[PDB]
Short mmCIF file of C-alpha atoms and ligand atoms in Angstrom, two decimals:
data_model
loop_
_atom_site.label_atom_id
_atom_site.label_comp_id
_atom_site.label_asym_id
_atom_site.label_seq_id
_atom_site.Cartn_x
_atom_site.Cartn_y
_atom_site.Cartn_z
CA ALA A 1 0.00 0.00 0.00
CA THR A 2 1.03 3.60 -0.51
CA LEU A 3 0.67 6.74 1.62
CA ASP A 4 0.77 10.04 -0.24
CA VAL A 5 1.20 13.40 1.57
CA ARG A 6 0.84 16.60 -0.47
CA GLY A 7 0.79 20.33 0.16
CA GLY A 8 -0.21 22.95 -2.36
CA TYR A 9 -0.90 26.61 -2.95
CA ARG A 10 -3.42 28.05 -5.40
CA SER A 11 -2.52 31.55 -6.63
CA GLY A 12 -5.97 32.80 -7.75
CA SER A 13 -7.92 31.68 -4.72
CA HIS A 14 -5.02 32.41 -2.29
CA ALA A 15 -5.59 29.02 -0.68
CA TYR A 16 -3.34 26.38 0.83
CA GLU A 17 -4.36 22.75 0.49
CA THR A 18 -3.13 19.52 1.97
CA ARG A 19 -3.93 15.95 1.01
CA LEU A 20 -3.40 12.64 2.84
CA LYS A 21 -4.15 9.66 0.58
CA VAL A 22 -3.83 5.91 1.12
CA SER A 23 -4.05 3.51 -1.83
CA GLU A 24 -3.62 -0.21 -2.48
CA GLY A 25 -3.82 -2.54 -5.48
CA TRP A 26 -4.27 -6.34 -5.47
CA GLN A 27 -3.15 -9.15 -7.79
CA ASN A 28 -6.81 -9.94 -8.63
CA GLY A 29 -7.04 -6.44 -10.24
CA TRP A 30 -8.90 -4.43 -7.60
CA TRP A 31 -7.64 -1.03 -6.49
CA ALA A 32 -8.88 1.30 -3.76
CA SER A 33 -8.00 4.67 -2.36
CA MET A 34 -9.19 6.98 0.39
CA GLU A 35 -8.17 10.55 1.00
CA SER A 36 -8.81 13.68 3.02
CA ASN A 37 -8.27 17.16 1.59
CA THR A 38 -8.07 20.41 3.56
CA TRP A 39 -8.39 23.93 2.14
CA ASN A 40 -7.40 27.16 3.97
CA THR A 41 -7.80 30.61 2.40
CA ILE A 42 -5.24 33.17 3.65
CA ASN A 43 -12.43 19.73 4.13
CA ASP A 44 -13.53 16.83 1.95
CA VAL A 45 -13.20 13.09 1.92
CA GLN A 46 -13.05 10.90 -1.19
CA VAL A 47 -13.09 7.15 -1.63
CA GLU A 48 -12.40 5.44 -4.91
CA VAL A 49 -12.53 1.84 -6.07
CA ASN A 50 -11.96 0.26 -9.45
CA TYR A 51 -11.18 -3.05 -11.09
CA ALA A 52 -8.74 -3.91 -13.92
CA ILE A 53 -10.11 -5.88 -16.84
CA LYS A 54 -7.09 -7.00 -18.87
CA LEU A 55 -8.02 -6.95 -22.56
CA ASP A 56 -4.51 -8.10 -23.59
CA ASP A 57 -0.89 -7.63 -22.45
CA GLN A 58 -0.96 -3.84 -23.06
CA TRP A 59 -4.62 -2.73 -22.76
CA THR A 60 -6.71 -2.51 -19.57
CA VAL A 61 -10.19 -1.18 -18.91
CA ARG A 62 -11.08 -0.10 -15.37
CA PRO A 63 -14.69 0.54 -14.46
CA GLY A 64 -14.83 2.34 -11.16
CA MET A 65 -16.43 4.79 -8.81
CA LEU A 66 -15.34 7.90 -6.90
CA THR A 67 -17.48 8.98 -3.94
CA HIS A 68 -16.91 12.48 -2.56
CA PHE A 69 -18.19 14.01 0.70
CA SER A 70 -18.08 17.73 1.60
CA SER A 71 -20.19 20.30 3.41
CA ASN A 72 -22.66 20.59 0.48
CA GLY A 73 -23.41 16.84 0.33
CA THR A 74 -22.44 13.64 -1.48
CA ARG A 75 -21.22 13.34 -5.07
CA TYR A 76 -20.79 10.02 -6.90
CA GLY A 77 -18.52 9.57 -9.90
CA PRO A 78 -18.98 6.29 -11.80
CA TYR A 79 -16.35 5.99 -14.51
CA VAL A 80 -14.56 3.89 -17.06
CA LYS A 81 -10.83 4.33 -17.62
CA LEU A 82 -8.96 2.85 -20.59
CA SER A 83 -5.21 2.40 -20.17
CA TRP A 84 -2.49 1.50 -22.66
CA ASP A 85 0.96 0.41 -21.55
CA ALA A 86 2.50 1.40 -24.89
CA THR A 87 6.02 0.56 -23.72
CA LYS A 88 7.66 -0.47 -20.45
CA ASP A 89 8.34 3.28 -19.95
CA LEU A 90 5.23 4.95 -21.50
CA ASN A 91 1.61 4.64 -20.41
CA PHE A 92 -1.46 6.42 -21.76
CA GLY A 93 -4.91 6.72 -20.21
CA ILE A 94 -8.34 8.11 -20.98
CA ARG A 95 -11.22 8.26 -18.52
CA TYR A 96 -14.84 9.36 -18.70
CA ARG A 97 -16.45 10.09 -15.33
CA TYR A 98 -19.98 11.29 -14.62
CA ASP A 99 -20.03 13.36 -11.40
CA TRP A 100 -23.59 13.16 -10.11
CA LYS A 101 -24.62 15.21 -7.08
CA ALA A 102 -27.00 13.61 -4.52
CA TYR A 103 -28.21 17.08 -3.52
CA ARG A 104 -29.80 20.00 -5.33
CA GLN A 105 -28.47 23.54 -5.67
CA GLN A 106 -29.93 26.73 -7.09
CA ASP A 107 -29.27 26.98 -10.85
CA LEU A 108 -28.93 30.11 -13.01
CA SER A 109 -32.72 30.09 -13.62
CA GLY A 110 -33.50 30.17 -9.90
CA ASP A 111 -34.62 26.53 -9.75
CA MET A 112 -33.20 23.77 -7.60
CA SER A 113 -31.51 21.33 -9.94
CA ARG A 114 -28.49 19.02 -9.83
CA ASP A 115 -25.08 20.42 -10.80
CA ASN A 116 -23.99 17.21 -12.54
CA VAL A 117 -20.79 17.18 -14.59
CA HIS A 118 -19.34 15.24 -17.55
CA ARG A 119 -15.63 14.84 -16.88
CA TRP A 120 -12.88 13.65 -19.23
CA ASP A 121 -9.26 13.00 -18.19
CA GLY A 122 -6.27 12.13 -20.35
CA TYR A 123 -3.09 10.74 -18.86
CA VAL A 124 0.48 10.37 -20.06
CA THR A 125 3.18 8.87 -17.84
CA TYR A 126 6.76 8.65 -19.00
CA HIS A 127 9.54 6.94 -17.07
CA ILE A 128 12.48 9.06 -18.25
CA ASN A 129 15.19 7.04 -16.46
CA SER A 130 15.78 5.23 -13.15
CA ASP A 131 15.67 8.62 -11.32
CA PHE A 132 12.66 10.41 -12.87
CA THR A 133 9.10 9.91 -14.05
CA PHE A 134 7.11 12.70 -15.67
CA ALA A 135 3.31 12.63 -15.70
CA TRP A 136 0.78 14.86 -17.36
CA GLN A 137 -2.97 14.76 -16.71
CA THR A 138 -5.30 16.87 -18.83
CA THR A 139 -8.91 17.41 -17.79
CA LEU A 140 -12.06 18.80 -19.33
CA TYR A 141 -15.31 19.04 -17.44
CA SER A 142 -18.61 20.46 -18.55
CA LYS A 143 -21.91 21.24 -16.88
CA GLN A 144 -24.83 18.97 -17.69
CA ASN A 145 -27.37 21.43 -16.31
CA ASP A 146 -27.93 25.24 -16.01
CA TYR A 147 -24.76 26.16 -14.08
CA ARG A 148 -21.44 27.77 -14.88
CA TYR A 149 -17.93 27.55 -13.53
CA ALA A 150 -16.05 30.50 -11.98
CA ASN A 151 -14.51 31.18 -15.44
CA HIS A 152 -18.09 32.21 -16.49
CA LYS A 153 -18.35 29.18 -18.82
CA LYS A 154 -20.24 25.88 -18.98
CA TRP A 155 -16.84 24.17 -19.15
CA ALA A 156 -13.35 24.32 -17.73
CA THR A 157 -9.99 22.59 -17.84
CA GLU A 158 -7.17 21.46 -15.62
CA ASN A 159 -3.64 20.52 -16.64
CA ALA A 160 -1.38 18.89 -14.08
CA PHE A 161 2.37 18.29 -14.55
CA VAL A 162 4.14 16.03 -12.08
CA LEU A 163 7.86 15.28 -11.77
CA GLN A 164 8.53 12.25 -9.54
CA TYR A 165 11.95 11.41 -8.16
CA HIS A 166 12.59 7.76 -7.32
CA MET A 167 14.76 8.46 -4.32
CA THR A 168 14.47 4.90 -3.06
CA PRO A 169 12.30 2.02 -4.25
CA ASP A 170 9.80 2.85 -1.45
CA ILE A 171 10.05 6.69 -1.34
CA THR A 172 9.05 9.03 -4.17
CA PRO A 173 9.16 12.78 -3.57
CA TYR A 174 7.51 14.87 -6.25
CA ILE A 175 6.83 18.39 -7.41
CA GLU A 176 3.82 19.51 -9.38
CA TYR A 177 2.45 22.47 -11.31
CA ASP A 178 -1.23 22.71 -12.27
CA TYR A 179 -3.06 25.26 -14.37
CA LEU A 180 -6.71 25.08 -13.30
CA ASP A 181 -8.15 27.59 -15.80
CA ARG A 182 -9.69 30.89 -14.60
CA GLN A 183 -11.44 29.18 -11.69
CA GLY A 184 -9.82 31.26 -8.97
CA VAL A 185 -12.17 33.07 -6.61
CA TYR A 186 -10.90 35.54 -4.02
CA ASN A 187 -12.35 38.42 -2.03
CA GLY A 188 -15.66 38.40 -3.98
CA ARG A 189 -14.10 38.20 -7.46
CA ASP A 190 -14.22 35.16 -9.77
CA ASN A 191 -12.58 34.39 -13.14
CA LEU A 192 -9.08 34.59 -11.60
CA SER A 193 -6.18 32.72 -13.20
CA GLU A 194 -5.58 29.67 -10.95
CA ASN A 195 -1.94 28.49 -10.86
CA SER A 196 -1.33 25.63 -8.46
CA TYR A 197 2.05 24.67 -7.03
CA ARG A 198 2.38 21.38 -5.12
CA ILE A 199 5.00 19.31 -3.34
CA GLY A 200 4.56 15.86 -1.96
CA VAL A 201 5.87 12.44 -1.22
CA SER A 202 4.52 8.99 -1.92
CA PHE A 203 5.83 6.09 0.17
CA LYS A 204 5.28 2.36 0.67
CA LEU A 205 3.65 1.51 4.00
C1 LDA B 1 4.53 24.37 -3.20
C2 LDA B 1 4.11 24.98 -1.87
C3 LDA B 1 3.77 23.93 -0.83
C4 LDA B 1 2.70 24.45 0.12
C5 LDA B 1 2.55 23.61 1.39
C6 LDA B 1 1.24 23.97 2.09
C7 LDA B 1 1.15 23.42 3.51
C8 LDA B 1 -0.15 23.81 4.21
C9 LDA B 1 -0.05 25.09 5.04
C10 LDA B 1 -1.19 25.20 6.06
C11 LDA B 1 -1.30 26.60 6.67
C12 LDA B 1 -2.62 27.26 6.27
N1 LDA B 1 -2.70 28.65 6.73
C13 LDA B 1 -1.64 29.47 6.11
C14 LDA B 1 -3.98 29.24 6.33
O1 LDA B 1 -2.60 28.73 7.98
C1 LDA B 2 -4.67 7.39 6.19
C2 LDA B 2 -5.26 8.77 5.90
C3 LDA B 2 -6.16 8.75 4.67
C4 LDA B 2 -7.48 9.48 4.91
C5 LDA B 2 -8.49 8.54 5.55
C6 LDA B 2 -9.75 9.27 6.03
C7 LDA B 2 -10.03 8.97 7.50
C8 LDA B 2 -11.20 9.79 8.02
C9 LDA B 2 -10.80 11.24 8.28
C10 LDA B 2 -11.95 12.19 7.96
C11 LDA B 2 -11.54 13.65 8.14
C12 LDA B 2 -12.29 14.32 9.28
N1 LDA B 2 -12.37 15.76 9.05
C13 LDA B 2 -11.04 16.32 8.76
C14 LDA B 2 -13.28 16.04 7.92
O1 LDA B 2 -12.82 16.36 10.06
C1 LDA B 3 -2.17 8.17 -32.68
C2 LDA B 3 -0.68 7.89 -32.46
C3 LDA B 3 -0.46 7.26 -31.09
C4 LDA B 3 0.89 7.60 -30.46
C5 LDA B 3 1.78 6.39 -30.24
C6 LDA B 3 2.67 6.44 -29.01
C7 LDA B 3 4.03 5.78 -29.27
C8 LDA B 3 4.34 4.53 -28.45
C9 LDA B 3 3.73 3.26 -29.06
C10 LDA B 3 4.75 2.15 -29.31
C11 LDA B 3 4.29 0.78 -28.84
C12 LDA B 3 4.15 -0.23 -29.98
N1 LDA B 3 4.01 -1.58 -29.44
C13 LDA B 3 3.67 -2.48 -30.55
C14 LDA B 3 5.27 -2.06 -28.84
O1 LDA B 3 3.10 -1.65 -28.56
C1 LDA B 4 -5.83 5.24 -24.03
C2 LDA B 4 -4.87 5.65 -25.14
C3 LDA B 4 -5.55 5.78 -26.50
C4 LDA B 4 -4.55 5.54 -27.64
C5 LDA B 4 -4.91 6.26 -28.94
C6 LDA B 4 -5.10 5.32 -30.13
C7 LDA B 4 -3.79 4.70 -30.61
C8 LDA B 4 -3.88 3.18 -30.60
C9 LDA B 4 -2.63 2.48 -31.14
C10 LDA B 4 -2.94 1.02 -31.48
C11 LDA B 4 -1.90 0.01 -31.00
C12 LDA B 4 -1.07 -0.55 -32.16
N1 LDA B 4 -0.34 -1.75 -31.77
C13 LDA B 4 -1.22 -2.93 -31.76
C14 LDA B 4 0.71 -1.98 -32.78
O1 LDA B 4 0.22 -1.64 -30.64
C1 OCT B 5 2.21 36.39 0.48
C2 OCT B 5 1.41 35.09 0.34
C3 OCT B 5 2.05 34.16 -0.71
C4 OCT B 5 2.08 32.70 -0.26
C5 OCT B 5 2.61 31.82 -1.40
C6 OCT B 5 3.03 30.41 -0.95
C7 OCT B 5 4.00 29.80 -1.98
C8 OCT B 5 4.32 28.34 -1.66
C1 OCT B 6 2.76 33.39 -6.71
C2 OCT B 6 3.41 32.31 -5.84
C3 OCT B 6 4.43 31.49 -6.63
C4 OCT B 6 4.83 30.21 -5.88
C5 OCT B 6 6.03 29.53 -6.55
C6 OCT B 6 6.48 28.27 -5.79
C7 OCT B 6 7.93 27.92 -6.13
C8 OCT B 6 8.10 27.61 -7.63
C1 OCT B 7 -7.33 -6.86 -27.93
C2 OCT B 7 -7.08 -5.43 -27.43
C3 OCT B 7 -8.26 -4.51 -27.75
C4 OCT B 7 -7.93 -3.02 -27.53
C5 OCT B 7 -9.03 -2.30 -26.74
C6 OCT B 7 -9.77 -1.24 -27.57
C7 OCT B 7 -10.94 -0.62 -26.77
C8 OCT B 7 -11.72 0.39 -27.62
C1 OCT B 8 -5.21 -3.97 -31.27
C2 OCT B 8 -5.26 -2.52 -30.77
C3 OCT B 8 -6.55 -1.81 -31.21
C4 OCT B 8 -6.51 -0.31 -30.88
C5 OCT B 8 -7.89 0.26 -30.51
C6 OCT B 8 -7.78 1.73 -30.06
C7 OCT B 8 -8.97 2.16 -29.20
C8 OCT B 8 -8.98 3.69 -28.99
C1 OCT B 9 9.78 7.21 -29.53
C2 OCT B 9 8.28 7.41 -29.24
C3 OCT B 9 7.94 8.90 -29.03
C4 OCT B 9 6.50 9.25 -29.48
C5 OCT B 9 5.61 9.62 -28.29
C6 OCT B 9 4.49 10.59 -28.68
C7 OCT B 9 3.42 10.67 -27.58
C8 OCT B 9 2.11 11.29 -28.09
C1 OCT B 10 3.70 34.00 -13.21
C2 OCT B 10 3.05 33.04 -14.21
C3 OCT B 10 2.91 31.63 -13.61
C4 OCT B 10 3.16 30.51 -14.64
C5 OCT B 10 4.25 29.54 -14.14
C6 OCT B 10 4.35 28.28 -14.99
C7 OCT B 10 5.24 27.24 -14.29
C8 OCT B 10 5.53 26.02 -15.18
C1 OCT B 11 1.33 18.76 -23.00
C2 OCT B 11 1.15 20.26 -23.24
C3 OCT B 11 -0.14 20.79 -22.59
C4 OCT B 11 -0.01 22.28 -22.25
C5 OCT B 11 -1.35 22.89 -21.82
C6 OCT B 11 -1.13 24.13 -20.96
C7 OCT B 11 -2.35 25.06 -20.95
C8 OCT B 11 -2.13 26.24 -19.99
C1 OCT B 12 3.87 23.76 -19.60
C2 OCT B 12 3.20 24.45 -18.40
C3 OCT B 12 2.87 25.92 -18.68
C4 OCT B 12 1.36 26.20 -18.63
C5 OCT B 12 1.00 27.59 -19.17
C6 OCT B 12 0.17 28.44 -18.19
C7 OCT B 12 0.97 29.64 -17.65
C8 OCT B 12 0.15 30.94 -17.65
C1 OCT B 13 1.18 18.70 5.64
C2 OCT B 13 1.62 18.66 4.17
C3 OCT B 13 3.05 18.12 4.03
C4 OCT B 13 3.66 18.44 2.66
C5 OCT B 13 4.53 17.28 2.20
C6 OCT B 13 5.86 17.73 1.59
C7 OCT B 13 6.80 16.53 1.43
C8 OCT B 13 8.18 16.94 0.88
CL1 CL B 14 -29.93 13.79 -12.51
CL1 CL B 15 -19.87 28.34 -22.11
#
């Protein structure tokens, strides 16, 4: 199993975040994770499970679900991820997730609806050498219903860039930059450029 500890700062929202995440995978193909996230402007819990269906030596499909709890209520995210181990050192992934909210919120028409979201994620991971792995995750999400993001649009993006250092077989420090679109909100103003800078470490328990 792996414990991941991460700290970050978001420039638009002027917010620190921390994450503690524990994950395990099994030989039968199951995988599960649980995490807690904190956010402090100058909490949530998520649980995820999936299963690997091996289509051949290089291709895997993982149906799964992400459940998310916060002050507003519960959100469920059933998904299917397709992964391709193109080489020993290069992996690609694509995931569709439907983030469905178990609670209603006021929409832009004044009605109480569900702020459900269609979410797509692309993944590239490249093992550069014994010392370094570089990962990029690109994200698009769009509103199913009559809502908008803080960028004033029905859609938004995230792009995350992670450099992992394989310090020991069981310890992997990493640094990360994310651009989270103009989703920053601070001091009563939205549409702020949201740069995110993170540092963390992943280790074997
Ligand atoms: C790349 C920068 C790493 C940032 C590490 C963030 C650690 C969390 C700090 C918690 C303090 C929150 N605060 C400032 C509101 O008290
Ligand atoms: C091994 C740590 C991984 C996180 C596991 C989650 C355990 C439950 C903690 C819930 C957080 C309680 N809180 C902060 C919302 O008050
Ligand atoms: C649409 C073009 C897709 C980009 C291809 C990425 C390059 C790595 C693929 C090489 C793997 C070939 N093979 C047969 C060993 O699996
Ligand atoms: C989840 C990644 C999606 C990959 C995009 C489509 C490129 C597929 C390449 C086919 C593989 C060719 N082959 C059998 C020689 O490895
Ligand atoms: C003056 C507040 C800036 C805090 C930025 C933190 C960078 C890691
Ligand atoms: C505006 C804050 C910038 C934080 C940079 C962190 C070190 C690259
Ligand atoms: C035999 C491998 C099939 C590749 C999976 C394609 C899924 C659209
Ligand atoms: C034998 C490999 C087939 C590739 C299918 C690609 C699905 C996006
Ligand atoms: C030698 C293979 C490099 C091509 C990788 C392109 C990834 C989209
Ligand atoms: C001051 C502009 C922030 C963009 C930094 C990009 C880091 C890779
Ligand atoms: C792999 C290159 C993606 C760069 C996207 C950055 C958008 C701010
Ligand atoms: C390759 C990371 C740079 C992303 C561009 C966003 C900076 C404003
Ligand atoms: C409380 C967050 C800790 C940040 C981890 C940094 C590891 C180098
Ligand atoms: Cl619905
Ligand atoms: Cl729009």
